[PDB]
C-alpha cells in the first residue's frame, strides 16, 4: 500500500 | 540490494521499474535498451511455481526513477506494454536457464537527463570484460535484506566469480547462459541484489570506449547476501541473437 | 542505439560517478 497513485491516464 | 548505497541522481538512466497496475506495487527491475524496448527476467512476468503469469494489461514500465514510491512527476514516464516476448526455452522448472525477456513499449519514451538506454555487449566487450574478478554494477529497489525497503534505488558493485566457485556454491545445475558475482567470505566486503531487484541490470563500463554495458540479468539467488553464495546472472551476450531476432523482426 | 551507455549526467558531461573507479580498477 506503499506507493503514491500515479495519474489516473496510465 | 544488501550491502549496497543510494544511487546518484542519473547514475542509472537506463533503469526501469516494472509495476504492478492493481495492486499498485514494484514487480521487478528492468532496463532501457532502446526507445521503444525494455529488456528483464523471463521469471519477473511467467513463473508457474508461483503462479505468476502477466499479460501485457497487467503491467507498466516506469522510467527515469529515482524514488521507490513516489511519483516523480516531472522527471519520470509512464509507459503502457505493446507485446511481451519471453525466451522461448526459458527453463522455469528446473534451474530458470535463459531467464530473459523483452516488453516492446506502446510508444516511444523520450530520452532526458534521467532516461537513457544502455548498451548491449558485442562479442569482443563480452569477451573482453567478463574475467573473475572483473567488477559490474547491480541495481535496484529490491529488498534491503533477506527476510527493509529503499527510499531510493540502490546500487552495489560486485567481482563475477570463478566459474567452479559459483558451481561449488549451489545444488542447482548451473549453465552457460549464466554467471555468478558477489565476494567470497575471505574478501571482506559484501553486498548481492534479492528479492525485487529480479530482471534489473549488471552493468560493466567498457575501459575501450568508456560506454555502459548491460552484461547481465538478476535472475535467482539461495538468499540474500549470504556468505559463500553468490547472485546469478542471465548471461546477456549468449543469448544476443535471440534478442537480435526478436527485435529485427518485430521492430 | 548510436549513443547508448553514455549518461547524460556523467559521461557526456565528462563528470565521474563516486564508484565507477572501482570498476576500472579491478579491469586489470
Ligand atoms: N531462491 C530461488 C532459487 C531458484 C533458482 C532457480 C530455479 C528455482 C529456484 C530464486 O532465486 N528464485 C525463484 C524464482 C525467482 C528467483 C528469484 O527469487 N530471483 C530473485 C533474486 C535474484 C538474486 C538474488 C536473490 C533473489
Ligand atoms: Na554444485
Ligand atoms: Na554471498
Redesign the pocket.
Known amino acids: 500500500g506503499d506507493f503514491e497513485e500515479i495519474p489516473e491516464e496510465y | 540490494i544488501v550491502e549496497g548505497s543510494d544511487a546518484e541522481i542519473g547514475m542509472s538512466p537506463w533503469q526501469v521499474m516494472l509495476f504492478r497496475k492493481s495492486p499498485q506495487e514494484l514487480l521487478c527491475g528492468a532496463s532501457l535498451i532502446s526507445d521503444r524496448w525494455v529488456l528483464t ?1 523471463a ?1 519477473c512476468l511467467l ?1 508457474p ?2 503462479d505468476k503469469n502477466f499479460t501485457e494489461n497487467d503491467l507498466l514500465v516506469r522510467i527515469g526513477k529515482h524514488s521507490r514510491t513516489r511519483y516523480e512527476r516531472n522527471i519520470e514516464k509512464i509507459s503502457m506494454l505493446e507485446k511481451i516476448y519471453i525466451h522461448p526455452r526459458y527453463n ?1 522448472r ?3 536457464d535463459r531467464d530473459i525477456a523483452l516488453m516492446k513499449l506502446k510508444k516511444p519514451v523520450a530520452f532526458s537527463d534521467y532516461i537513457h538506454p544502455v548498451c548491449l555487449p558485442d562479442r569482443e566487450t563480452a569477451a573482453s570484460l567478463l574475467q573473475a574478478g572483473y567488477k559490474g554494477r547491480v541495481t535496484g529497489w ?1 529488498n534491503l535484506k533477506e527476510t527493509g525497503q529503499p527510499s531510493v534505488l540502490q546500487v552495489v558493485n560486485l567481482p563475477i566469480v570463478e566459474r567452479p566457485v559459483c558451481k561449488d556454491s549451489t545444488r ?1 545445475r548451473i549453465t552457460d547462459n549464466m554467471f555468478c558475482a558477489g565476494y567470497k567470505p575471505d574478501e571482506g566486503k559484501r553486498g ?4 525485487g ?2 530482471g534489473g541490470p549488471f552493468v560493466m563500463k567498457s575501459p575501450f570506449n568508456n560506454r555502459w554495458y548491460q552484461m547481465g540479468i ?7 547476501d549470504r556468505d559463500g553464495k553468490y ?2 546472472y542471465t548471461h546477456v551476450f549468449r543469448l544476443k541473437k535471440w534478442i537480435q531476432k526478436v527485435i529485427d523482426q518485430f521492430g | 542505439e548510436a549513443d547508448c551507455g553514455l549518461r547524460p549526467l556523467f559521461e557526456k558531461k565528462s563528470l565521474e560517478d563516486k564508484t565507477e573507479r572501482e570498476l576500472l580498477e579491478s579491469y586489470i
Do not use: K, Q, R, T
Not at chain 2, 192 to 195: G, L
Not at chain 2, 218 to 224: F, H, K, L, Q
Open positions: 527476467a521469471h513463473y511455481p508461483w522455469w528446473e534451474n530458470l529490491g542447482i548481492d541484489a534479492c528479492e531487484d529480479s538478476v535472475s535467482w539467488g539461495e538468499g540474500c547472485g546469478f
